[PDB]
Amino acid sequence: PNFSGNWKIIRSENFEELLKVLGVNVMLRKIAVAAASKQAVEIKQEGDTFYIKVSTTVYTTEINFKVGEEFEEQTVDGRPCKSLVKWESENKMVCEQKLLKGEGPKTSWTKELTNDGELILTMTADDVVCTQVFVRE
């Protein structure tokens, strides 16, 4: 696998529906959908160690993890969580998250490198799956 690269979003499906499950009110959902269309992802992968920078026009976040080791990040709506990433196949990984405080929908994400060279990210809250597709810059 080589997830390493600079990725630009080409498609974003069901993101508003995900935010709605997560309690985000309608105007903020619409503005977040617009922000998501400018999403860029930078990945550096060394073996099972990942550095990931996700950004939009006015915001940027760095995610560092090693597969199989718990780390801390935030859910989509912005709540701190404990995350754990495992491989599901050669080029797909899945992250399960657990809220640090309180309760809420069950969230997770997946990252996949397809044969055709796309990066597919999925983000899930309960029953609702958002799918985002990227290509290399």
Ligand SMILES: *C/C=C(C)/C=C/C=C(C)/C=C/C1=C(C)CCCC1(C)C
């Ligand atoms: C491997 C790639 C990952 C884990 C990407 C995660 C992406 C996000 C947490 C994106 C979040 C965003 C929002 C919550 C609001 C709209 C802007 C986004 C898409 C950057």
